[PDB]
Design a protein that fits this description.
It is classed as dna binding protein. The structure is cut from a larger assembly and holds chains A and B. Chain A is of the alpha+beta class. Chain A has 18 helices and 23 strands. In chain A, the strands form four sheets. In chain A, strands 17, 18, 19, 20, 21, 22 and 23 form a seven-stranded antiparallel beta sheet that branches. In chain A, strands 9-3-2-1-8-10 form a six-stranded mixed beta sheet. In chain A, helix 14 (about 480-500) runs antiparallel to helix 15 (about 505-520). The longest helix of chain A has 24 residues, at about 360-380. Chain A starts with a strand and ends in an 8-residue tail after the last strand. In chain A, about 35% of the residues are buried. Chain B is elongated and about 45 Å long. Classes of the chains: A alpha+beta, B mainly alpha. The interface of A and B includes residues 435, 617, 618 and 645 of A. Chain B binds a DNA/RNA duplex through loops.
RNA sequence: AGGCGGGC
DNA sequence: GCTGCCGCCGCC
């Protein structure tokens, strides 16, 4: 037996590779994976009728000696018309470049599901793998251990809740701009290693690094290594990276800024060992790499990194955990999250001082080191790893995806796992603002959980709502809600435990857990509402209209409390409390929250943002003074701006 | 009256956009200072811009 | 209508 | 690099 805690994966040559820990790094190549295809028999046919027809035909095209196939009763409840609620299908296991079209019409069957199945999705669904977990299971990778398996059935998930220590490496990159070619070149790189980050226990504040090293080339604490050019530096970088072999690469704006630069410089300078940025070994870059397609290039980089988790604190995901930030500049994030001050140094290596001024160069290198240490500490403080891990386990997708910031990612998997487990066949892949200055405290009330509560209250599902699948624009009448209910209940149990919990450690962990559950539930709507693999216009509309009724009554309730709605939409409603006191305003806000819940017992709104003053200009365009309470109750004012001219690049 | 490009400009004239300046209506000095109207233009001052023939007909 | 930025 | 034209984005 072989035990590995899997972290990430990658697809190559119709195989699936898993990278994880066994603690050393390891990769497992998975062969024998098949797409599960489901052939829908015609009126008066059986799975055997299909079996006789297509199987001999499939053996020929794909050239297989034998193909596993069996009858299986499956349910279907999605948007494809003429397909029945339940039928006997022929399940064909077709091993993993020519795909079988879904409209394969024959005298036996008329439809086929799972034709374009993705290999990772197939593995995860079939083996019921729910995110990063423990699994009981030459020169292909940068890992310490390289193994393969002949069949995916050899891999089964374990119940173990704990996880191994991770190897994190914080990166900080200082660049230079060459005006000739308009190319951002790399001047220095800081590498800070934290070889034993345990997410099973809280990470100690101001945690000390196991190793700190800085590499630098001429533009014109820890070890410091000097190089004669950029190429030698980057070669050394790749080698050090391979030896360190981190599970996580931490940084600030890596995803869409510094990681792209790094890759492109390794490409430009023809660095042969570039692939150590990930855990898969490659001799050559992808053919279409550097075709000027800023969109496709991003995919290539993410792919090459496969095996190492990219922990970016300033990406779409990271920003969501630091809403009190406004610019999300490294110094700003450090202040907001850790309440510590850092004055950012503006380093411009084009400046001539850096060529001969040893103290200038030294000051710049010190700035880079500090930034690296800051990035790591922030990532641990905001607990980006733990939350994204939880979200991945809840949705059952890839950790890499979560750390990235996708919308059709945890919202598609969560549904594929629920429905597949319950024997279903899955599909193939507002109030005008009161413009002006508001002198009284305005409270932003968050109705994120509007839709989930609506879907749960009225029991809205693909399985419950009779709808016209021919006409999606037809409004219909009043699995998914049960799943929602489970998430809500779990969240309740966590909060109940929080009231009693005394350990600051266990407490904080509980807070993360409930946050993950909340985000998972509040992302369920996008599944059927955004134009999504599970998109269903009749269901989206049905939910929206009930959302309109609820909001209308809500407006009436606010007015009933003599409050004025300054602005509102499906996500939030801002209410003028009419007070000039933080306390009086909060009492008003709580009364409003309670009032709404009495009318809609499954709809739980809360006070999200307190504006001492609010200058509202348009829907999503305003300036305001947010009040942030400190540990000792102490209240502090801060300026917050959204959508104004002042937010345009300059 | 016009039986992407215009809504914002009209709100901007009311101090509802950008720097939120509540622009003062133009006085005659300001109107007269603008580039002289040509064919197809109706801004300016008819006492300066129209012929005596046109003004006389209007005043009659 | 004028000014600034980006792309062809 | 500049020049000039066309489109988009606000501002003034």
């Amino acid at each position: 037996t072989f035990q590995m805690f899997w972290l990430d994966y990658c697809e190559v040559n119709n195989t699936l590779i898993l990278f994880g820990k066994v603690c050393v790094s390891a990769m497992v190549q998975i062969n024998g994976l098949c797409r599960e295809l489901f052939f829908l028999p015609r009126e008066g046919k059986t799975p055997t009728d299909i079996h006789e027809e297509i199987i001999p035909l499939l053996m020929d095209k794909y050239g297989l000696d034998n193909i596993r196939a069996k009858p299986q009763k499956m349910k279907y409840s999605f948007e494809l018309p003429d397909i029945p609620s339940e039928s006997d299908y022929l399940k064909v296991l077709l091993p993993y470049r020519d795909t079988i079209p879904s409209d394969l019409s024959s005298d036996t069957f008329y439809h086929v599901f799972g034709g374009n199945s993705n290999i990772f999705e197939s593995f995860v669904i079939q083996n019921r793998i729910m995110g990063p977990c423990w699994l009981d299971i030459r020169n292909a990778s940068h890992c310490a251990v390289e193994v393969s398996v002949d069949k995916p059935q050899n891999i089964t998930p374990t119940t173990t809740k704990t996880m191994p220590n991770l190897r994190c490496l914080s990166l900080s990159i200082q660049t230079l701009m060459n005006p000739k070619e308009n190319k951002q070149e790399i001047v220095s790189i800081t590498l800070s290693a934290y070889r034993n980050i345990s997410l099973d226990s809280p990470i100690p504040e101001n945690i000390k690094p196991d190793d700190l090293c800085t590499l630098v080339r001429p533009p014109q604490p820890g070890r410091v290594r000097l190089f004669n050019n950029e190429k030698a530096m980057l070669s050394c970088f790749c080698a050090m990276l391979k030896v360190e072999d981190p599970d996580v690469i931490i940084g600030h704006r890596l995803q869409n800024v510094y990681l792209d630069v790094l890759a492109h410089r390794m490409h430009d300078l023809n660095i042969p060992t570039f692939s150590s940025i990930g855990r898969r070994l490659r001799r050559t870059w992808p053919e279409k790499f550097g075709r000027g397609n800023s969109n496709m290039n991003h995919f290539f980089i993410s792919d090459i990194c496969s095996g190492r988790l990219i922990c970016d604190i300033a990406n779409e995901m990271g920003q969501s955990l630091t809403p009190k930030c406004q610019s999300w500049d490294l110094s700003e994030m450090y202040q907001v999250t850790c309440e510590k001050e850092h004055k950012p140094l503006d380093i411009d290596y084009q400046n001539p001082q850096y060529q001969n001024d040893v103290n200038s160069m030294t000051m710049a290198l010190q700035e880079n080191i500090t930034n690296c240490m800051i990035s790591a500490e922030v990532s641990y403080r905001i607990q980006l790893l733990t939350l994204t891990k939880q979200l991945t386990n809840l949705a059952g997708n890839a950790w890499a995806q979560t750390l990235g910031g996708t919308r059709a990612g945890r919202n598609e998997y969560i549904l594929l796992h629920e429905f597949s487990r319950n024997g279903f066949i899955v599909p193939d892949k507002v109030f005008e603002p009161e413009k002006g200055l508001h002198k009284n405290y305005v409270l932003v009330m968050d109705f994120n959980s509007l839709y989930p509560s609506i879907i749960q209250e009225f029991n809205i599902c693909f399985t419950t709502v009779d709808r016209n699948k021919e006409d999606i624009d037809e409004l219909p009448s009043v699995v998914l809600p049960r799943l929602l209910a489970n998430l809500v209940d779990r969240r309740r149990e966590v909060k109940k435990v929080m009231k009693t919990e005394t350990d600051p450690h266990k407490r904080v962990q509980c807070d993360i857990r409930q946050q993950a559950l909340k985000l998972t539930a509040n992302s369920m709507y996008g599944c059927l509402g955004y134009v999504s693999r599970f998109y269903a216009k009749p269901l989206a509309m049905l939910v929206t209209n009930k959302g309109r009724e609820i909001l209308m009554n809500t407006r009436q309730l606010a007015e009933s409390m003599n409050l004025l709605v300054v602005y509102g939409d499906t996500d939030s409603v801002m209410i003028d409390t009419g007070c000039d006191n933080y306390a009086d305003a909060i009492k008003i806000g709580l009364g409003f929250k309670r009032l709404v819940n009495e009318r809609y017992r499954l709809l739980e709104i809360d006070i999200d943002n307190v504006f001492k003053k609010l200058l509202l200009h348009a829907k999503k365009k305003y300036a305001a003074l947010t009040v942030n309470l400190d540990k000792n109750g102490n209240g502090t004012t801060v300026l917050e701006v959204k959508g104004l001219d002042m937010k345009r690049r300059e | 009256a016009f039986t992407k490009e215009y809504r914002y400009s009209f709100r901007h004239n009311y101090g509802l956009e950008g720097n939120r300046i509540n622009y003062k209506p133009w006085d005659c000095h300001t109107i007269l200072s603008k580039p002289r109207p040509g064919r197809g233009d109706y801004h300016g001052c008819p006492f300066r811009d129209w012929s005596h023939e046109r003004l006389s007909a209007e005043l009659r």
